[PDB]
Each structure stands twice: as structure tokens, then as C-alpha cells.
RNA sequence: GUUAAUUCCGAUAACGAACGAGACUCUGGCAUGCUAACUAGUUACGCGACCCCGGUCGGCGUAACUUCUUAGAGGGACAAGUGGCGUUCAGCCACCCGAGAUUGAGCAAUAACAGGUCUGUGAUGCCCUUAGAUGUCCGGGGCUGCACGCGCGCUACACUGACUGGCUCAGCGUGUGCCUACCCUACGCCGGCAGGCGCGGGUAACCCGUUGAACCCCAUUCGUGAUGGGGAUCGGGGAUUGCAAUUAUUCCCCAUGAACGAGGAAUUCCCAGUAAGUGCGGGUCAUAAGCUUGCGUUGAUUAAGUCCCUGCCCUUUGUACACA
């Protein structure tokens, strides 16, 4: 039974959140880094925190981690959100129009349009899942 | 753990007081708590984007 | 002898393990044979680490029982050595081969258990354990209150178990357990 | 009835009331297309040979 | 889902938290690196003794050192790395490297027990006695009594053993007292023995003590006989401690020589330096361990699972119980 507790885990998350650039991959390097940056009164707790820091860095190298706020991953998230794609799928030359939608558009102001394509209605009214 | 002698009987008094921690050691102990993990704040530094020098003498 | 290991005066080789079910659980060939079966320990720390212990050391460790004899490993090494001498001076073959044949011909292939009892087959390591325990119990029963010594009784039990003449107490208890398991199935 | 040999390929679980018998999938080494499920006493690791006296009786899977 | 754990992952009318667990302290191996050593040793010599250049000497002294000895700062292990299982998170198994990849003890939450202690207190409330005392002292007896049953232990029921010689290995420890009148003992004589007499050492890594402890190792005697197993009971004698041994205080010598042939229903403890065999220290001690607590030697079988029995902890259900 080798399971870390919350006093190890939350403190290690704060250490990685505040000092992500100083920490690395090697255990015997970031162990001494966590010793120098954090006041840990015992070697056993220091080794637990350093091991959980190494395991979270392995999780970072494998992919994204939920309970963390890294500035570089936040910048990458902001870049992927602010990425602008090519021309839209809303701007099409052929837009499939159902006949009742064509009727209500005729009853509205814009009845006859330029780049619409009216389609045939789905014959056969079978749309419900059978019971049981 | 103290006693008090009343007229009817004798009552016991248990007073347990947890002392806070200080770095000096006057009001409390010198060694900190094992559960408390002290993490300092990183200094607000600005990353340089232009190679400059600080030559003197 | 830096090439081959001489168990006392006995070679490591010329050991014909007939049963293919016991070739991993009898550790006597080329890796776990030594000069004497005496050792320090550590063989019973893990679950399947007991199978890597050599069978002569297992007989050595299982011989010391019943209070007054628990903790005389040098003394039961003396017993096993003189018993191997008596086995060679009666049979004329390798006493290690006689002991392996005794394990094969004395280990019961089935047993009864409770899930009214039902008969199930046993593990091969469990069969080696049961065979060693039955032959040690037969040797101690033959040596209890008798002029015939413990080495002579253990030699007679191993030779009768390798022969299969239904004279050994281990062979008799194996036949009894086989009859009970054939009954309650 | 003859006496067969079977190699353990998978252990399933602990059976019995006291938990003394393992539920063991054994492949017959003579005919590898036929395999059965039995109860075996003692410690069983996957990949060893057992000596079956008969293949008629077979316990129910729980 | 996972863990020894309300330990975490993750959903979530919850969020922020607190005690416990975890964390903590000590004990144990890993260090040929540091600090140190005439209250400990090692290596080289100067000798001396013995055997035929070499070997031994805890026989002596010294030029370095801590490897053996000791205790301080430390460091070292954290699921660290690989391969699988698993929401790829929490975690689990195996393995290379490695002294350890689960050592043990202490502390140990809220609330309760009509649990034990008034016979620990000049801690104490209420009741009783208080001079022919339930205060205190002296002398003796008893707390040991014996048709019986129960509980914890010790010795054996034997040849894997008994007896006799030879050999060979420890650490917890303790040691001269306010009153206190009582310490541990080296060595030489008297005696078979318990012991007695003299000078010594030690307030303790100096002296007991290199702590020459048992099982175990080797060689004769025994021969399946309640026998050289076992030592219950009992007689005669000799010494130690104490004012006083009778109801044998304890120790030693000779002799008498019982049950016990592996123990029924039932029941206790345990899985690694563990059980068990075995002996040595402290407390009780003037005389004393068949007890207890520590320590050392030899040292396994079987298992890495389960609710079957006995109980415990979460969820749901039922209650006509709530001294449940």
C-alpha cells in the first residue's frame, strides 16, 4: 500500500504550479530543487512530495493535466482557442431546404433566394424506436 | 491536570493548550509542524528577449 | 572442482526426472545443487520462492519437528547425509535419483476437500509438499520407539517409496487418500 | 480411463467455503483445442503441468 | 475504481475545513566518505618464547589509521526506471540496478462504560471508631492448611535420546545506597560440595569480562526394559542469609525411585530471523525466578486466500427494542 495523501498532493501541485520552470524530469535533481524551494521538515515527506512531482511531470509529458494551471499550457490553450480556420461551412453554394421550410420562408419576407436547393420530403413516416 | 476541592466533592480540571509556531522560539517551539508544508512565493521576474551585457571595470 | 558441483561425493548430473509435471518444482539440476543442503534462509519470503529451494534442503528443513528437535539443522544434515549413504549402500544407485523417484511415486495425484466432501486434483508444488510431509512422517513413525535409527528408517522409507511395494507409510497414506478421494467423488 | 496431463493457462478465482481451491483453466497438452475448468488445491501459477486422473468430472462455474 | 485507512481519482447541493489515519519520534541492517579516539582495536616494527626462511603468542611497548568498536552531522527509497492491467487518473503485479521495493514499538479522534483502584497518596466528600481504639507498637500464628474442580506455567513420556570427557561461539544489561544498617568480584590457600579466610580492582568502554552461557560439534557407555528417560515423595548429613527456618528460607552429598508409552470433547498462539528449542541480564532480593520484561544462539513447515465459524466496518431493508 503506497498511496499518497492530500498533504503531499496539494503541496506538490502548488510547487509545480509556482515553480514549473525550475522542475524537470530527473528525480535526484527536482528532489533537491523542491528541498531548496520548499521548507519540508523531514526527508520522508520530502521524498513523497518529490516522487509525486516526478509522477505529475510524467503526466504532463504524456498529456494535459486537469488540476493544474501551467502558463505555457494556458498560452497554448489560448492560441488553440484564438486559432482562425479557413472559409466557413456556413457559406455554401448548395444548401438543402426542406419543403415546409421553403413554405414558411415563402410566407416570410425572403421567399425566393439565390443559393438554396429544395429537396424531396422523406416519404414513409417511420421515425420512432419500437417498444420494449 | 489539576484538582479543586469544593464543599461537595473534588473536581478535576484538564487544560490542554496548543502553542503556535514562531521562528524565534519565544512564544512557541522552534521546529515547525510536520504536516505544514511551507512554500515560498516566487519573485516576479521578467524574461529577457534581447541579449545584453553588464560589463564593468 | 570448478566445473561440476559435488554434493558431498555425489554428482549434480545423472538425475532423470521422469515426470514432466515436476521439472520446474524439483530444483536439483545444474542451478540449485550445492555441497551441503545447509543454508541461511530467505527461501520462504515470497509465495513461489519456496519452489526454488532445493529438495534436499526441503527434506532437511521438514525433518526437524516436534518441539525437542526444532532448530537442529546441522544435526538433520548429518541425518540426511548418513541416510543417503545407507540408500547407496542398499540400492547401489544415486540417492538423489532414489529420492526423486520416491517423490514421484509417493505424491498423491488427487485429494478431497470441502466446498460431504468432493475430490479435486492438487497443484504439483502441493504434491511435492504432501510427499515430503508423508515420507518424513513415515520415517519419524518408524524411528519412534525402535532400535532402528532415524537414518536407517528414512533410508528404508525412501527406498520403499521409490520401489512402490506398498510397504512405506507414505505409500500407504497415498493409497488411503486415493481410496477416500475415489469414494467421495 | 487413462491418465492425462494438462497445462494451466489461466487461474480464475478462489473457490470453496474457506477459500482453499483455485478455479483453473487447463489446456490439454495432447489436444490443445479442448480445454476445461477445474478446481485445484494449493498454490497455482500459470504455465505448469498437472496430472489429471480423469476428465469426466467438472465443477460448475460460479 | 483503488488503498492497511473517510487514502485518493472522479461524478456530485455543495464549498471551506478540523481530529484520527497518514504524517511524527525511536529502534535495525547500507556507508572502505567526514568528525573523533591511551576507558576499543587494526597494520607494520623493537624484542622475548616455542617448532622445523616461515607460523603462533588477549606477552610487552611505539609510526600512522578507524576496517572491526562507539556516537554526531548526514546521506540513502521515493512506486525511482522498465514491461503488463486499469477511465490511462487514483492505483496493482513482476523484474534490472540495488542493504532494505510492506521491520517493530510509542502517541493514537468524538462519545460512553454505574468496568478496576477509597488497599498508592498528608487527592478527597459522606458514614463509623477514637482510649478496654478500626490509631500505633510488641510476641506468636495465618495469608502455604486439603476428600474436590478450574486457569496460567515448568519437567518429561525418550535411541532425532540419557550419561561421561574434548572443543567452541553474545548482547540487552547490572554493580559500594539521605534514612539504608544491604554492591559486582579478579587472584591464592582449606574442603568433594555449598562455602570460609586474605590482600587487590571498579561509582563503571578502566574491574568482573575478549563477558570462555546453553542447544549444537566430536569419541566411548547404553539397547526398547517404565531402562542409564523422568525426578514426584521421603530419611540422614553439611553450609550460606537473617534476631528468629518449626510448616523442610535457599544451596550441596548419599539413598529411597511414584504416575507418565504422544493424552477425549473442546481450546491457545503464529506465518520470516517468525513460531519453537535453548540459555543470559533487570524488577520482586538480606537470603530467591517454577513469574514477568528485555537480549543472544540454532531456526523451520505451511499460506500470500476467505467470510465457512467467531467478530468488526460502509449501503439498503424490517422492527411492536431504545436499562437498545
Q: How far apart are CA C132 and CA C123, in angstroms?
A: 14
**Which nucleotide's C1' sits nearest to the alpha carbon of C76?**
E160
* Interior/surface letters C132-157, b for 16+ CB within 10 angstroms, e for the rest: bebbbbbbbebbeeeeeebbbbbbbb
- Give resolution, Å, one decimal: 3.1
- Which candidate from C19, C25, C121 shows the least CB-CB separation from D38? C121
Whole-number Å distance, CA C66 to C1' E151? 25
CB contact under 8 A, C115 and D43: no
Say if residues A46 and A34 touch (Cβ distance below 8 Å).
yes
Please report residues of C whose CB lies closer than 8 A to that of D58.
none
Whole-number Å distance, CA C38 to C1' E295? 26
- Which candidate from C120, C125, C185 shows the least CB-CB separation from D38? C120
CB contact under 8 A, A38 and B37: yes
| Chain position carrying cell 510397504 | C167
Nearest to D8, CA basis, from A69, C25, C49: C25
Please report residues of A whose CB lies closer than 8 A to that of B41.
18
Q: How far apart are CA A46 and CA A15, in angstroms?
A: 12
Interface contact C24, partner D, CB < 8 A: yes
Q: In the PDB record, what is the listed experimental method?
A: cryo-EM
| Chain position carrying cell 500459470 | D46
State the count of interchain CB pairs (< 8 A) between C and D: 69
In Å, how far are A97, A100, A112, A115, C115 from A121, measured between CA atoms?
10, 9, 19, 19, 67
Task: Judge D/C contact: 3 or more CB pairs < 8 A.
Answer: yes
**Which nucleotide's C1' sits nearest to the alpha carbon of A50?**
E78
CB contact under 8 A, B34 and A41: yes
Residue C45's Cβ-count burial label (10 Å; 0-12, 13-18, 19+) is: exposed
SS3 (DSSP) at C50: coil
C66 dihedral zone (left: phi>0; alpha: psi -120 to 50; beta): left
Shortest CA distance from C126: residue in chain D: D42
Q: How far apart are CA B56 and CA A54, in angstroms?
A: 42
List all residues 6 or more positions away from C29 whose beta carbon is below 8 Å from its beta carbon.
C12, C13, C15, C17
Nearest to A68, CA basis, from A5, A23, A27, A16: A16
List all residues 6 or more positions away from C16 whose beta carbon is below 8 Å from its beta carbon.
C97, C100
Q: How far apart are CA D42 and CA B14, in angstroms?
A: 57
Nearest to D25, CA basis, from D46, D51, D56: D46
Shortest CA distance from D57: residue in chain C: C185
Strand partners, D26: D8, D36
Q: Give chains near D: 3+ CB pairs under 8 A.
A: C
Shortest CA distance from D5: residue in chain C: C21
Strand partners, D38: D24
Interface contact C112, partner D, CB < 8 A: no
Q: Would strands C6-7 and D21-28 be described as parallel, antiparallel, or unpaired?
A: unpaired
Shortest alpha-carbon distance between residue D7 and chain C (Å): 9
Please report residues of A whose CB lies closer than 8 A to that of B35.
7
Whole-number Å distance, CA B11 to C1' E127? 21
Interface contact D13, partner C, CB < 8 A: no
List all residues 6 or more positions away from C73 whose beta carbon is below 8 Å from its beta carbon.
C38, C60, C61, C64
CB contact under 8 A, B39 and A38: yes
Please report residues of D whose CB lies closer than 8 A to that of C109.
3, 51, 53
Cell digits of residue A116: 438554396
Shortest CA distance from A9: residue in chain B: B37
**Which nucleotide's C1' sits nearest to the alpha carbon of C132?**
E301
Interface contact C19, partner D, CB < 8 A: yes
Amino acid at each position: 500500500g503506497r498511496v499518497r495523501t492530500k498533504t503531499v498532493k496539494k503541496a506538490a501541485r502548488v510547487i509545480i504550479e509556482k515553480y514549473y520552470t525550475r522542475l524537470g524530469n530527473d528525480f535526484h535533481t527536482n528532489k533537491r530543487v523542491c528541498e531548496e524551494i520548499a521548507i519540508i521538515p523531514s526527508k520522508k515527506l520530502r521524498n513523497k512530495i518529490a516522487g509525486y512531482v516526478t509522477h505529475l511531470m510524467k503526466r504532463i509529458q504524456r498529456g494535459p493535466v486537469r488540476g493544474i494551471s501551467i502558463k505555457l499550457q494556458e498560452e497554448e490553450r489560448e492560441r488553440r482557442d484564438n486559432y482562425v480556420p479557413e472559409v466557413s461551412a456556413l457559406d455554401q453554394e448548395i444548401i438543402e431546404v426542406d419543403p415546409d421550410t421553403k413554405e414558411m420562408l415563402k410566407l416570410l419576407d425572403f421567399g425566393s433566394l439565390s443559393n438554396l436547393q429544395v429537396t424531396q420530403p422523406t416519404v414513409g413516416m417511420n421515425f420512432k424506436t419500437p417498444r420494449g | 491536570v489539576r484538582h479543586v476541592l469544593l464543599r461537595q466533592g473534588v473536581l478535576g480540571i484538564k487544560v490542554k493548550i496548543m502553542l503556535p509556531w514562531d521562528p524565534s522560539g519565544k512564544i512557541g517551539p522552534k521546529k515547525p509542524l510536520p504536516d505544514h508544508v511551507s512554500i515560498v512565493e516566487p519573485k516576479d521576474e521578467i524574461l529577457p528577449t534581447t541579449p545584453i551585457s553588464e560589463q564593468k571595470g | 572442482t570448478p566445473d561440476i558441483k559435488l554434493f558431498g561425493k555425489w554428482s549434480t548430473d545423472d538425475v532423470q526426472i521422469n515426470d514432466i509435471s515436476l521439472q520446474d518444482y524439483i530444483a536439483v539440476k545444474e542451478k540449485y545443487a550445492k555441497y551441503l543442503p545447509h543454508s541461511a534462509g530467505r527461501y520462504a519470503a515470497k509465495r513461489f520462492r519456496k519452489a526454488q529451494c532445493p529438495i534436499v534442503e526441503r527434506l532437511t528443513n521438514s525433518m526437524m519437528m516436534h518441539g525437542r528437535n526444532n532448530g537442529k539443522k546441522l544435526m538433520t544434515v548429518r541425518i540426511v547425509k548418513h541416510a543417503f549413504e545407507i540408500i547407496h549402500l542398499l540400492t547401489g544407485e544415486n540417492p538423489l535419483q532414489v529420492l526423486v523417484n520416491a517423490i514421484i511415486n509417493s505424491g498423491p495425484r488427487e485429494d478431497s476437500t470441502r466446498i460431504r466432501r468432493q475430490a479435486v486434483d492438487v497443484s504439483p508444488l502441493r504434491r511435492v509438499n504432501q510427499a515430503i510431509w508423508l515420507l518424513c512422517t513415515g520415517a519419524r513413525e518408524a524411528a519412534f520407539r525402535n532400535i532402528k535409527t532415524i537414518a536407517e528408517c528414512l533410508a528404508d522409507e525412501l527406498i520403499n517409496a521409490a520401489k512402490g511395494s506398498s510397504n512405506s507409510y507414505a505409500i500407504k497414506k497415498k493409497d488411503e487418500l486415493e481410496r477416500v478421494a475415489k469414494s467421495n467423488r | 480411463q487413462p491418465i492425462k496431463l494438462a497445462r494451466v493457462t489461466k487461474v480464475l478465482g478462489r473457490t470453496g467455503s474457506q477459500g482453499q481451491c483455485t478455479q483453473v483453466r487447463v489446456e490439454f497438452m495432447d489436444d490443445t483445442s479442448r480445454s476445461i475448468i477445474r478446481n485445484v488445491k494449493g498454490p497455482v501459477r500459470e504455465g505448469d503441468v498437472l496430472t489429471l486422473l480423469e476428465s469426466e468430472r467438472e465443477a460448475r462455474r460460479l
